From Swiss-Prot, chain C:
<comment type="function">
    <text>Component of the large ribosomal subunit. The ribosome is a large ribonucleoprotein complex responsible for the synthesis of proteins in the cell. Binds to G-rich structures in 28S rRNA and in mRNAs. Plays a regulatory role in the translation apparatus; inhibits cell-free translation of mRNAs.</text>
</comment>
<comment type="subunit">
    <text>Component of the large ribosomal subunit. Homodimer. Interacts with DHX33.</text>
</comment>
<dbReference type="GO" id="GO:0000463">
    <property type="term" value="P:maturation of LSU-rRNA from tricistronic rRNA transcript (SSU-rRNA, 5.8S rRNA, LSU-rRNA)"/>
</dbReference>
<comment type="similarity">
    <text>Belongs to the universal ribosomal protein uL30 family.</text>
</comment>
<keyword id="KW-0597">Phosphoprotein</keyword>
<dbReference type="GO" id="GO:0003735">
    <property type="term" value="F:structural constituent of ribosome"/>
</dbReference>
<dbReference type="GO" id="GO:0003723">
    <property type="term" value="F:RNA binding"/>
</dbReference>
Curated annotation (Swiss-Prot), chain D:
<feature type="compositionally biased region" description="Basic residues">
    <location>
        <begin position="1"/>
        <end position="25"/>
    </location>
</feature>
<feature type="modified residue" description="Phosphoserine">
    <location>
        <position position="30"/>
    </location>
</feature>
<protein>
    <recommendedName>
        <fullName>Large ribosomal subunit protein eL29</fullName>
    </recommendedName>
</protein>
<feature type="modified residue" description="N6-methyllysine">
    <location>
        <position position="4"/>
    </location>
</feature>
<comment type="function">
    <text>Component of the large ribosomal subunit. The ribosome is a large ribonucleoprotein complex responsible for the synthesis of proteins in the cell.</text>
</comment>
<feature type="region of interest" description="Disordered">
    <location>
        <begin position="1"/>
        <end position="32"/>
    </location>
</feature>
<feature type="modified residue" description="N6-acetyllysine">
    <location>
        <position position="32"/>
    </location>
</feature>
From Swiss-Prot, chain E:
<comment type="subunit">
    <text>Component of the large ribosomal subunit.</text>
</comment>
<dbReference type="GO" id="GO:0003735">
    <property type="term" value="F:structural constituent of ribosome"/>
</dbReference>
<dbReference type="InterPro" id="IPR036948">
    <property type="entry name" value="Ribosomal_eL21_sf"/>
</dbReference>
<feature type="region of interest" description="Disordered">
    <location>
        <begin position="111"/>
        <end position="144"/>
    </location>
</feature>
<comment type="similarity">
    <text>Belongs to the eukaryotic ribosomal protein eL21 family.</text>
</comment>
<dbReference type="GO" id="GO:0005829">
    <property type="term" value="C:cytosol"/>
</dbReference>
<feature type="compositionally biased region" description="Basic and acidic residues">
    <location>
        <begin position="135"/>
        <end position="144"/>
    </location>
</feature>
Length: 175, 187, 168, 75, 159
RNA sequence: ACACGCAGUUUUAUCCGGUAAAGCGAAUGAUUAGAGGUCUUGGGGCCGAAACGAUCUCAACCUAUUCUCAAACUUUAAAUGGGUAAGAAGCCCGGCUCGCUGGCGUGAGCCGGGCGUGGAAUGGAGUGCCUAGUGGGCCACUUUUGGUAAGCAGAACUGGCGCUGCGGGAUGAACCGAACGCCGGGUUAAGGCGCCCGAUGCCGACGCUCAUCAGACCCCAGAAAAGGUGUUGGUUGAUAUAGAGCCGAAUCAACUAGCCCUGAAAAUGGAUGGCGCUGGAGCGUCGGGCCCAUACCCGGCCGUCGCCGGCAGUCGAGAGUGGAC
RNA sequence: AAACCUCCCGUGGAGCAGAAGGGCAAAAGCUCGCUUGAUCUUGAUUUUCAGUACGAAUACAGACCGUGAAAGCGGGGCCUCA
RNA sequence: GUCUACGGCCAUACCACCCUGAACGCGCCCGAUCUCGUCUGAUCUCGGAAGCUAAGCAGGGUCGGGCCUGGUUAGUACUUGGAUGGGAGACCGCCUGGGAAUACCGGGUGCUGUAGGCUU
């Protein structure tokens, strides 16, 4: 499984009706995937892992993207992860600060890849929950909980280095 | 980058006769024009048979032609043979016929003309019936040659009746171990 | 909820070459009239067709074509098989002569029969020469992996329209 | 100086180069391998089939007349 | 190299199943076979006379000769270059009737019935079989109860 | 304007298997440990002249259990796979023949008549002879035999080199892509975009990493067990204003996963390909843009194959009439 | 503890010549009574197959038979090698 | 409802114990002259009908053993195809399809063909 700018999808599906079971129950899942095809594939994977249901033996009643209810609001998202390392699998709980649930999930994927070299196919996401200022255990996200936030940009390393390459003036890093 | 097997892309069917004689080539031109113009398939079949080699157009016997013309329905029809018509000595009553062939033996020609029949060449047949109407197409026995007796399942094999290549048939040239039950085995 | 019907036809494009191909995969590819790389063909969907596409899944990318995709494929790169010869559909006379017995007399009838799978979809598709599509402009994600795992092979039902736009 | 013993690596490709075919099925197969008593009975039946040919011809004529009467009644 | 024995490698093939040894049931003896009947061959360890070779086990062929208590059957055998239709004599106990042809015969009878019918009516009926079509788009009713959420189960070492 | 048959294919029904797996509280063989058994006998022993009288013990066995197994075990048992049938060579009638078989009847063979697209997709098929060269192979995914291992020897399916050029892996048999007539334009695959060397000369995104042996891309050209408060995350467990004399707010411990370090020693001077690179030109997850092979599209030319190809000199483009009287 | 007799349980854990596998319980094992189908002669088919032999084997057919009341079985050894 | 004779599928039919069988029938049972065969009329054969459900047999029961069929085990073990996926390896993860078997927990404990009897 690859990853990009992930989006959240609500997928409801059920096994195809049978003469013994005329009205099978429906199951709903939240899958974070780049597109609906991979979202449905991951939904079928998780459904096969959990219940006795297969893609050929079932059907997805409805797959639809879920939009963030408060895009302009900054939120703390706690994500429960179950990934596979070189050794045995482990369970983790991480906290991120972002405006969207899909963005938080993407940031979690990038952080997992950067810190543990864990691939998206080995990463399984269980639950993502929005939490208030309290109930936060990670100091990296706790330090930003401050009303009178104040910090400068000390070492402003300049960009546009290949804009005119030879110049008389040396650049400046204090602003 | 396409997977096409060129093993049998070239068809091996003949296009022109290998013979360098001029009369056959003129007949080939005539029947090429007739086949490519007329809608009748008789001209196409005649052209294909003209293209065939000597062994592929065996001579037709007078008795075989007589028995094929005696069939009910083909009364007063011209017989078309691309090979040669050969006289048969074991037939006495020869009714008059209308025979079209490349060649006719002298004896068969005399028999047909004495019986009151008519012999036509291929150009005359084209002039008479360009599309081959009222024609009975006949040919000699293709497997009549003794060559085909040596073909098929090889000898020394069960349920095989193929004539082997022997320098001279005799008592002490074959019918020994491999053919006699008293000597080894037989097939 | 309203579950949409499974599509009656699908568009399949071979994405890899002819070097190092399993015998069964090659047989299915040549049965689907997919011999050269970047060749497309409309295949109606059923149990047998889906099983064959599953067999040759790593070697093909297939999806559910759109009406505009069908129109562009038939118009820009539409060739008919007449007398075993690939002849462009420059006029409706060729289609009328070939498929007149089936109520198909023009490009519009051909497109309708291709899109809304009818009784003579087999005859229309067999008359249609396989579409020799060009290389995908803008590149590919990955030829050797499945579409779900970031590659281009496999089922890409809706994105096959984007692929057709980039190739046709 | 040992050599390779046995292998069938390219054998399948060699077989399928010419496209191995099923045996040619032809109607009216041979009667070889049938019990001699049954063969004798069938030979006798075929030999004596000529007996009672007129009865079969008369029955066929009667059937043709019946079919003609039936079609005349239908029309 | 391996031996060319006739019964080599038939430890499990020519062996009766569990709790099915003993006297052979008489239905196999008292069921008839005609010429041209499709029959699948399955060897039996109990009866040794007329036992077919291991290569013909599971193969299906048509009957061409019927003796007193044995059947002559032509089967297609592939030997390294080609498929040959060869005739073998197999005793009754090592032979079964094939229902694959019976399934087709029943469909033929149904087709004959459905062609005799619906002909005076004028309505042409579909006789050809069809592969599995699309699933005939329909509505799914979530009557009151919402779909059940499925959370992945966290890992735990059990063993 | 008008199709029969055939297939390293699939589907629909029907059979075949005893391999993976699993079991031995089910058969056979191996095998650990406790409970109830003078079952049954026997050895050492102790209380006994002895006693199945009390006490355990070691020997083979049992009664319900329990730990671990089997290529030459199996009650079960897949995935893959192997035969078939998907109609004209088929069905429904009527009548004859039989020295075979039978109470009448069978069963087979003969003749006459009525009923046609028999699942999906693709292919034009069938047949007969002359017949060179070859009969030293090798490599690769997967399964697997001997061997500690082998660029070792020997097998099964498939694909390659052999017989093969081309783009990439610096270099190159077998790797990735892709297969070859001579060219112009465009776009790609596998791969890459600091210079060599075409292209990131993006105001790329998020984090990790200091190495006085850093690291830098399938085959592949190199490292293990054990450790580190170096650093970055996760899991669990306690105690802390009832204060972990004084200072004064967070603190301690056990595991675990990333980068780096010790472990880590060979001989001509030496190789991420070299320079070099540390706000990477290193590592993990990823965005656009770009670079191009004989690969794909369009076009020009050469040759080969096919057109039931056309032209002996004629009307005519879904052709579905012409012409007297 | 093992000599002979009796009762009960007894899926075959015995035996069927051999090496092993398969197979068999009013048998294919043991004991009886009769016998030499371990006889003669055309073909067809199966196993290595090149679908050639040899060896082995399977259904038949034409005669003489053996046995049983009979149905039937038997032209060597229950089958896979000799 | 059920029995006998000949059977088909061969445990849902088998094994152990207990209870009940009205009528026909199946048997126990009474004897060895005849037919027959043994050390013994024990078996078999023959000639019978004084007693009996004691036994066989049939029907029912056992929180019965076994057997048949289901859930669980379990979308687990395994497995077709794919990748320039991870790992030094051993091995593992993912995509695409198929999909087991113990232990454990539920249900059942013969259907049926032909001919002939009883409850008329």
């Amino acid at each position: 499984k690859a990853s990009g700018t992930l989006r959240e999808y609500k997928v409801v599906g059920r096994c195809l009706p049978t003469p013994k079971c005329r009205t099978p129950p429906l199951y709903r899942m939240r899958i974070f995937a780049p597109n609906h095809v991979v979202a449905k594939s991951r939904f079928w994977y998780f459904v096969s892992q959990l219940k006795k249901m297969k893609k050929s033996s079932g059907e997805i009643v409805y797959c639809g993207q879920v939009f963030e209810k408060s895009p302009l609001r900054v939120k703390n998202f706690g994500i429960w992860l179950r990934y596979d390392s070189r050794s045995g699998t482990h369970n983790m709980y991480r906290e991120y600060r972002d405006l969207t649930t899909a963005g938080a999930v993407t940031q979690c994927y990038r952080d997992m890849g950067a810190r543990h070299r864990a691939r998206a196919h080995s990463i399984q996401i269980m639950k993502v929950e929005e939490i208030a200022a309290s109930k936060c255990r990670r100091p990296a996200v706790k330090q930003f909980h401050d009303s009178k936030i104040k910090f400068p940009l000390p070492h402003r390393v300049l960009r546009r280095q290949h804009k005119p390459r030879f110049t008389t003036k040396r650049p400046n890093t204090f602003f | 980058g396409v997977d096409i097997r060129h093993n049998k892309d070239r068809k091996v069917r003949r296009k022109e006769p290998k013979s360098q004689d001029i009369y056959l080539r003129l007949l080939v031109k005539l029947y090429r024009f007739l086949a490519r113009r007329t809608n009748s398939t008789f001209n196409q079949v005649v052209l294909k048979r003209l293209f065939m080699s000597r062994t592929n157009r065996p001579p037709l016997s007078l008795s075989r032609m007589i028995r094929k013309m005696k069939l009910p329905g083909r009364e007063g029809k011209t017989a078309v043979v691309v090979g040669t018509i050969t006289d048969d000595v074991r037939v006495q009553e020869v009714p008059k016929l209308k025979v079209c062939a490349l060649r006719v033996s002298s004896r068969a020609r005399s028999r047909i003309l004495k019986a009151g029949g008519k012999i036509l060449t291929f150009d005359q047949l084209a002039l008479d019936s360009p599309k081959g109407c009222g024609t009975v197409l006949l040919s000699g026995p293709r497997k009549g040659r003794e060559v085909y007796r040596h073909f098929g399942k090889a000898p020394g094999t069960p349920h095989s009746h193929t004539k082997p290549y022997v320098r001279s048939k005799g008592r002490k040239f074959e019918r020994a171990r491999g053919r006699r039950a008293s000597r080894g085995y037989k097939n | 909820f309203y579950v949409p019907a499974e599509p009656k036809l699908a568009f399949v494009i071979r994405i890899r070459g002819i070097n190092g191909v399993s015998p069964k995969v090659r047989k299915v590819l040549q049965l689907l009239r997919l011999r050269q790389i970047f060749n497309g063909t409309f295949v109606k969907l059923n149990k047998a067709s889906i099983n064959m596409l599953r067999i040759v899944e790593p070697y093909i990318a297939w999806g559910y074509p759109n009406l505009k995709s069908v129109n562009e494929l038939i118009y820009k790169r539409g060739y008919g098989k007449i007398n075993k010869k690939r002849i462009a559909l420059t006029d409706n006379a060729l289609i009328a002569r070939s498929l007149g017995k089936y109520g198909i007399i023009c490009m519009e009838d051909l497109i309708h029969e291709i899109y809304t799978v009818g009784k003579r979809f087999k005859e229309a598709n067999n008359f249609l020469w396989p579409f020799k599509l060009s290389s995908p402009r803008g590149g590919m994600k990955k030829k050797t992996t499945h579409f779900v795992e970031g590659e281009d092979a496999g089922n890409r039902e809706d994105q096959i329209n984007r692929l057709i736009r980039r190739m046709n | 100086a040992k050599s390779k013993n046995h292998t069938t690596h390219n054998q399948s490709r060699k077989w399928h180069r010419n496209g191995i075919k099923k045996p040619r099925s032809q109607r009216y197969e041979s009667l070889k391998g049938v019990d001699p008593k049954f063969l004798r009975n069938m030979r006798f039946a075929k030999k004596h089939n000529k007996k009672g040919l007129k009865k079969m011809q008369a029955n066929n004529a009667k059937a043709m007349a019946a079919r003609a009467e039936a079609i005349k009644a239908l029309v | 190299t391996n031996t060319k024995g006739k019964r080599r490698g038939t430890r499990y093939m020519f062996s009766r199943p569990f709790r099915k040894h003993g006297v052979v049931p008489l239905a196999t003896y008292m069921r008839i076979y005609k010429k041209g009947d499709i029959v699948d061959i399955k060897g039996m360890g109990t009866v040794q006379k007329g036992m077919p070779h291991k290569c013909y086990h599971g193969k299906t062929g048509r009957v061409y000769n019927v003796t007193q208590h044995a059947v002559g059957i032509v089967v297609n055998k592939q030997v390294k270059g080609k498929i040959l239709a060869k005739r073998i004599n197999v005793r009754i106990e090592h032979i079964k009737h094939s229902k694959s042809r019976d399934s087709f015969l029943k469909r033929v009878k149904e087709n004959d019935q459905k062609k005799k019918e619906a002909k005076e009516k004028g309505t042409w009926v579909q006789l050809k079989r069809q592969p599995a079509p699309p699933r005939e788009a329909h509505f799914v009713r979530t009557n009151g109860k919402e779909p059940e959420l499925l959370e992945p189960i966290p890992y735990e070492f059990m063993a």
